[PDB]
Every structure is written in structure tokens, then in C-alpha cells.
Amino acid sequence: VLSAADKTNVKAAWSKVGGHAGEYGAEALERMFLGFPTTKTYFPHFDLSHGSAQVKAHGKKVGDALTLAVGHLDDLPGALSDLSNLHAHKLRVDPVNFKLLSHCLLSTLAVHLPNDFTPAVHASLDKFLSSVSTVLTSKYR
Amino acid sequence: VLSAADKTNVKAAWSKVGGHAGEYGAEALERMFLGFPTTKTYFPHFDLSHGSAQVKAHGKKVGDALTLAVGHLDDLPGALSDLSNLHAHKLRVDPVNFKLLSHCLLSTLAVHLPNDFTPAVHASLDKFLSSVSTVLTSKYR
Amino acid sequence: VQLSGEEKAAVLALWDKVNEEEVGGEALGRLLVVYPWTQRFFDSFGDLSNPGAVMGNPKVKAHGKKVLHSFGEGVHHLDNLKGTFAALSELHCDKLHVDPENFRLLGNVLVVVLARHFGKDFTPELQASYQKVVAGVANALAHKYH
Amino acid sequence: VQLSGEEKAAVLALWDKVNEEEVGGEALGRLLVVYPWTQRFFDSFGDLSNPGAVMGNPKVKAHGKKVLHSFGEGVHHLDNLKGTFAALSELHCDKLHVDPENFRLLGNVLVVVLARHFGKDFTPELQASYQKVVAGVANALAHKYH
Ligand code: HEM
Ligand code: HEM
Ligand code: HEM
Numbered sequence: 266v267l268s269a270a271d272k273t274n275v276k277a278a279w280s281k282v283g284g285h286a287g288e289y290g291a292e293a294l295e296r297m298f299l300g301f302p303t304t305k306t307y308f309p310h311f312d313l314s315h316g317s318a319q320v321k322a323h324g325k326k327v328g329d330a331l332t333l334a335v336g337h338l339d340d341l342p343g344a345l346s347d348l349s350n351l352h353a354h355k356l357r358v359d360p361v362n363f364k365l366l367s368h369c370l371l372s373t374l375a376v377h378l379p380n381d382f383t384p385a386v387h388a389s390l391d392k393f394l395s396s397v398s399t400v401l402t403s404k405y406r
Numbered sequence: 407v408l409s410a411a412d413k414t415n416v417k418a419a420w421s422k423v424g425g426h427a428g429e430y431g432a433e434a435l436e437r438m439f440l441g442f443p444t445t446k447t448y449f450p451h452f453d454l455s456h457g458s459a460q461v462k463a464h465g466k467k468v469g470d471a472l473t474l475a476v477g478h479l480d481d482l483p484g485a486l487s488d489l490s491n492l493h494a495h496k497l498r499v500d501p502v503n504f505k506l507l508s509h510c511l512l513s514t515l516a517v518h519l520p521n522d523f524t525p526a527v528h529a530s531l532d533k534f535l536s537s538v539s540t541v542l543t544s545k546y547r
Numbered sequence: 548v549q550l551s552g553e554e555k556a557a558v559l560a561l562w563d564k565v566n567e568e569e570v571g572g573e574a575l576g577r578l579l580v581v582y583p584w585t586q587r588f589f590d591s592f593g594d595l596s597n598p599g600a601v602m603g604n605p606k607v608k609a610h611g612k613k614v615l616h617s618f619g620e621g622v623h624h625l626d627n628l629k630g631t632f633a634a635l636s637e638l639h640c641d642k643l644h645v646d647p648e649n650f651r652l653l654g655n656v657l658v659v660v661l662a663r664h665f666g667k668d669f670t671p672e673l674q675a676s677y678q679k680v681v682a683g684v685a686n687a688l689a690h691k692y693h
Numbered sequence: 694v695q696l697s698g699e700e701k702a703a704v705l706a707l708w709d710k711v712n713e714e715e716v717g718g719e720a721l722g723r724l725l726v727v728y729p730w731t732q733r734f735f736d737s738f739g740d741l742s743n744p745g746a747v748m749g750n751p752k753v754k755a756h757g758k759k760v761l762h763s764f765g766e767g768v769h770h771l772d773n774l775k776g777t778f779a780a781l782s783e784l785h786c787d788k789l790h791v792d793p794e795n796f797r798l799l800g801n802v803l804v805v806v807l808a809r810h811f812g813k814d815f816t817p818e819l820q821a822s823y824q825k826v827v828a829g830v831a832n833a834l835a836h837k838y839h
């Protein structure tokens with residue numbers, strides 16, 4: 266999906282994320298709901314307060330999907346097929362929202378891995394998140 | 407690149423464009439320069455007045471590239487490789503500008519093929535233009 | 548909106564020829580067909596699942612007329628877009644939570660429909676003025692987000 | 694910008710801790726690295742071809758300080774963003790012709806740098822306020838395009 270250099274940077278950076286993917290996914294969602302309130306409309310059935318167990322549980326699923334993706338950089342379409350259906354076909358998520366969550370995920374990583382979040386790694390992660398976003402909204406294109 | 411249905415619609419619509427691809431490319435550029443003045447900055451060496459021979463000549467090259475693309479819907483990356491370099495690597499065209507030219511191209515087609523520019527064909531052409539745009543800016547991603 | 552007098556007159560003159568119903572119904576339908584995530588806001592309209600269903604839906608046509616009408620009010624009030632659209636801004640922002648990028652999408656779709664309907668009379672120059680108008684409308688509607 | 698008093702105080706308090714030079718140099722460098730087409734506007738700065746070259750370029754650091762300074766003026770003038778940035782708006786719009794989407798990109802990059810620098814102190818709540826600030830700045834700079 267990305268360049269080989271990018272592939273390397275992403276795999277390396279995610280190794281540093283390690284077992285915090287879940288925690289990070291949850292924090293990224295929290296920063297998105299607070300920062301971009303329009304996004305809350307997709308989660309009526311969710312308790313959005315800080316520490317909500319649903320957000321926590323949901324953060325884990327997001328972190329797992331990103332982990333999967335990192336493992337299948339050469340076949341995102343196939344690996345994320347099921348999620349593309351849900352997001353685009355079932356939920357009709359506005360494509361702009363992917364950009365907002367991407368931003369919130371980078372913010373989170375910056376908070377937690379300041380020494381690992383270098384300009385080169387930031388650039389590779391942005392490319393990765395955009396690639397993931399394209400697959401999730403491809404039922405549009 | 408697109409869905410089979412999309413592929414069909416695009417090939418069919420372009421057949422209607424026929425030998426006007428050039429003329430349309432030129433008009434699309436004119437509508438872009440007038441409508442979105444920021445875009446003129448990439449053409450200092452160009453006489454941008456209406457009827458400019460350069461715009462006319464340039465419109466032809468754009469129309470030819472789109473024609474090529476339609477012929478290689480299954481391999482845009484390969485077919486447009488050289489253009490991706492120029493636009494992204496050499497010219498550093500801001501990705502937003504692709505959206506503006508796309509819009510101006512659809513406007514042009516609407517002007518000239520009002521009976522052929524149906525909602526279904528409009529949707530397929532939008533997808534096509536976005537696909538072409540992704541390839542031309544892929545030296546970014 | 549920063550339009551000359553020549554530009555303003557040409558804009559108004561075209562509007563005299565705009566059938567709000569036809570144009571409006573087509574603009575909203577095309578938005579729904581071309582940018583499918585927009586369907587999420589119009590669930591109450593019934594079947595929007597395919598082009599045919601969308602284009603022939605009476606609620607779509609009726610609602611598109613409403614949209615175009617408010618547009619026409621903007622065209623006539625180029626000096627106070629913010630004032631003209633304040634109530635619609637509150638609605639779209641506070642109640643619906645429509646991302647403002649979509650305002651821009653609708654404006655561009657409107658422009659393509661005008662081109663389709665006016666042909667060669669929708670000149671590059673007239674289109675340029677209309678891009679200014681649609682931009683102005685999108686901004687006035689994004690107001691209560693700012 | 695629509696910020697409460699609590700929000701405003703928290704925003705100002707963080708700014709007291711912002712090193713304009715360090716933050717500014719890093720924000721502009723990251724923009725140039727992450728969104729490569731932005732390099733087109735800074736040809737006069739020399740070598741911007743690789744991360745190393747960009748991050749260590751003295752013109753980038755100097756210019757980033759300038760950017761952050763003007764940002765700081767905004768933070769201090771939340772009530773008149775449009776007035777504060779009018780001259781910069783004219784510059785970016787009329788002279789440079791920078792697409793306004795880029796203003797939004799820089800604001801978000803700034804937010805990521807603040808997160809990197811403040812860690813756990815850059816709470817989801819504080820980030821939310823800063824998103825309002827960056828949005829306000831981007832809008833005031835896009836002014837002369839409207
Ligand atoms: C990086 C991009 C994203 C990834 C990897 C992602 C991942 C996921 C995953 C793994 C699920 C679980 C589905 C299940 O098995 O229940 C999910 C569901 C969902 N996602 Fe996302 N998502 C992304 C972006 C978004 C965005 C931007 C939104 C809207 C702002 C969104 C809204 C939803 C909703 C509403 C659900 C269903 C939740 C439920 O009903 O429990 N997603 N997503
Ligand atoms: C649908 C998307 C586009 C297509 C298919 C396209 C196609 C082309 C082609 C075929 C060339 C000819 C290169 C040569 O052999 O000299 C070209 C050059 C160029 N394009 Fe595009 N282009 C697209 C979008 C854009 C946009 C959005 C811009 C900027 C607003 C742009 C700016 C340029 C410039 C400055 C040149 C070089 C012209 C010269 O020096 O004569 N292009 N493009
Ligand atoms: C140029 C931009 C737009 C204009 C001028 C406009 C105008 C209008 C008008 C006049 C109404 C009727 C309100 C009333 O009197 O109660 C309305 C309602 C509505 N608009 Fe828009 N609109 C715009 C963009 C959008 C977009 C882009 C969306 C969604 C993607 C949207 C979604 C809605 C919805 C869901 C309603 C309420 C429908 C109902 O339940 O009656 N609008 N808008």
C-alpha cells in the first residue's frame with residue numbers, strides 16, 4: 266500500500282506501541298468526541314463520558330484492527346474488507362471523520378511516545394492512516 | 407481501480423466525448439483558472455487569456471491523458487506513472503487542486519453532454535476522476 | 548461576497564431563469580447519488596438505495612425545492628449572507644451536526660446542474676461568479692461552527 | 694472563538710509554557726516533511742529535500758518562530774481573531790495564494806507538537822480547546838478568500 270521505507274517505519278513504530286494499542290485506541294476516541302463533537306452522532310448507544318467501559322471496549326477493537334492492518338500492509342483491502350462494509354455500507358460514516366480520528370490517533374501517539382514520534386515516523390504513520398481510511402471508505406469510491 | 411459497473415459507465419461516457427476530449431480539457435482548464443484563481447500560480451509561463459494557444463495545446467494533452475487512463479482502468483498506476491512524478495515530485499501540485507480541476511471537468515461535460523450526463527454516469531465519472539487524482543498525488547502518499 | 552456589479556447583474560439574470568423545483572430536485576438527488584454518506588441524514592425519506600429511487604422520490608424533489616428557494620434568497624441578499632442563513636446555520640450545525648464540507652459539496656453539485664441546464668450560456672465567467680456565490684453560502688451556513 | 698472562561702484560562706496557562714522557537718521550528722518542519730507539496734512555497738530556504746535537511750534548516754527554525762509568535766498573538770486576542778490576522782490574511786491570500794486547507798493542516802500539526810511536548814498534561818479536554826483555537830486562527834487567515 267505504502268513505500269517499503271514507509272512499511273518499515275510503521276512496523277517499527279507499532280512494535281513500540283506494543284500492548285497499548287487498545288489503551289491508545291480508547292484515548293484517541295475520547296479526544297475525537299471532545300475535540301470534534303459532530304462525531305458523537307454515530308454513537309447514540311454509547312456512554313461517552315470519560316472512563317466509559319464501552320469506549321474502553323471499543324478502543325480495544327480499534328487498536329486490534331490497526332494491529333491487523335500493520336500485519337497486512339500489502340493487502341489492506343482484503344484484511345479490512347469486513348470493516349469497509351460496516352463503515353461505508355452499513356454506517357454511512359462521512360469520510361471527513363476518518364481524517365479526524367487519524368489526527369486524534371497521531372495526537373495520542375505523540376503524547377505517549379514522544380521520543381519515538383519523529384518527523385519521519387510521523388510522516389509514515391500519516392500515510393498508513395490515510396491508507397486505512399481509503400479502504401474503510403472504498404465502498405464510496 | 408473502480409467497480410465493474412463504474413468501469414462500464416466510464417468507458418461508455420468517454421465514447422460519447424469522442425474527439426472532443428481535447429476541446430473539453432481546454433475548457434475545463436479555463437473554467438479552473440477563472441473560477442479558482444489560486445491555480446494560475448502553476449502556469450506563470452502560460453498566456454491564460456481566453457483562446458490562448460497554450461491552454462488550447464495544454465487542454466489537448468490533458469484530454470489525451472484522460473483518454474489513456476480510460477483505456478487502462480485496471481492499471482492506472484502504471485499508465486500514469488510518468489505524470490505522477492511530474493505533478494507530485496517535480497511540480498509539487500497541492501492535492502486540493504485535483505479536486506478543483508475534477509469539478510471543472512464535470513462542469514464541462516455537463517455543458518456539452520446534458521442528455522448523457524445522468525446521475526449514474528456523473529457518479530461513475532466522479533469516482534474515475536478521484537482515482538486519477540489519487541495516482542497523480544501518490545508520490546505524496 | 549466580493550462580486551463586481553457586472554458579476555452581480557449576470558448572476559441575478561440567470562436566477563430569473565431558474566426553476567427552483569426542477570433544479571432543486573436534481574441538485575439534492577445528485578448529492579445523494581454521488582456522495583452516498585449524505586443519505587444518512589435523510590432516512591425519513593424512505594428508499595434512497597438506487598439512482599432511480601432517489602431521483603423519483605417526491606420527498607427529495609420537495610426538499611430540493613426548499614433548498615433552492617433558500618439559495619435564491621442568498622442570491623438576492625449577497626450583502627448579508629450571514630444574516631440570511633443564521634437560522635439555517637443553527638439547524639444544520641446544532642441540530643443536525645452536518646459536517647460543513649458537505650455544504651461545499653452541495654454548492655458544487657448545484658453548479659454542475661446549472662451547467663447541465665444552461666449549456667453554453669453557463670460560461671466560464673458566469674461559472675466563476677457562481678463559485679463565489681456557492682462559497683459565500685457554504686461559509687454563511689458553516690457560521691455556527693466557528 | 695466560542696470558549697468558556699475555564700477553557701480560556703487553561704489555554705492561556707499552557708501558552709506561558711510554550712517555547713515559540715522550539716515549538717515553532719518543529720511545527721513548520723513537520724508540515725514540510727509530512728505534507729510535501731507545502732515545500733513549493735519555501736524554495737528560498739534552500740534544501741528541504743529530506744527530514745534531516747528540513748529539521749536542521751535555520752530558515753525553517755527562524756520562520757517557525759515567527760509563525761508561533763503570531764499564533765501567540767491570537768491566543769492572547771481570542772476576541773478579535775479577524776482583526777489580529779487581517780494583514781497576514783492579505784499576505785497568504787493575495788500575495789502567496791496559499792490554499793486555506795493548508796492553514797488547517799498547520800494548525801493540526803501544531804496540536805500534535807504540543808501533545809509531543811506536554812505529554813499527559815495535554816489532556817483530551819485541553820486538546821479540545823486548542824482545536825477551537827486552531828480552527829479560529831485558520832478561519833481568520835482564510836478571511837480574504839471569502
Ligand atoms: C482508523 C479508522 C477506523 C478503524 C480502524 C475503525 C475500526 C472499527 C472496528 C474494529 C469496529 C468494530 C465493529 C464490530 O465488530 O462491532 C468499528 C465499529 C464502528 N466504528 Fe469504526 N473505525 C474507524 C473509524 C471510524 C470513524 C471515523 C467513525 C465515526 C466517526 C467510526 C464509527 C464506528 C461505529 C459507529 C461503529 C459501531 C460501534 C458499535 O455499534 O458498537 N469508525 N470500527
Ligand atoms: C485530472 C488531473 C490531471 C491530469 C490528467 C493532468 C495531465 C497533465 C499532462 C498530460 C501534462 C503534460 C506534461 C508534459 O508532457 O509537458 C500536465 C502538465 C502539467 N500539469 Fe497537469 N494534469 C492534471 C492536474 C493538474 C492540476 C490540478 C494542476 C495544477 C493546478 C496541474 C498542473 C500542471 C502543470 C503546471 C503542468 C506543466 C505544464 C507545462 O509546463 O507546459 N495539472 N498535466
Ligand atoms: C447549500 C447548502 C444547504 C442549504 C442552503 C440547505 C437548506 C436547507 C433548508 C431550506 C432546509 C429546510 C429547513 C426548515 O425550514 O425546516 C434544510 C433542512 C435540512 N437539511 Fe439542508 N441545506 C444545505 C445543505 C445540507 C446538507 C449538505 C445536508 C446533509 C448532508 C443537509 C441536510 C438537511 C436535513 C437532514 C434537513 C432536515 C430535513 C427534514 O427533516 O425536513 N443540508 N436545509
Ligand code: HEM
Nearest residue numbers: 731734735759760763764781789791795796799800830834
Ligand atoms: C496558522 C497558519 C499560519 C500562520 C499563523 C502563518 C504566519 C506567518 C507569518 C507570521 C509570516 C511572516 C510574514 C511577515 O511578517 O512578513 C508568514 C509568512 C509566510 N507564510 Fe505563513 N502562516 C500560516 C500558514 C502558512 C502555510 C500553511 C503556508 C504554506 C503552505 C504559509 C506560507 C508562508 C510563506 C511562503 C511566507 C513568506 C516566507 C518569506 O518569504 O518570508 N503560511 N506566515
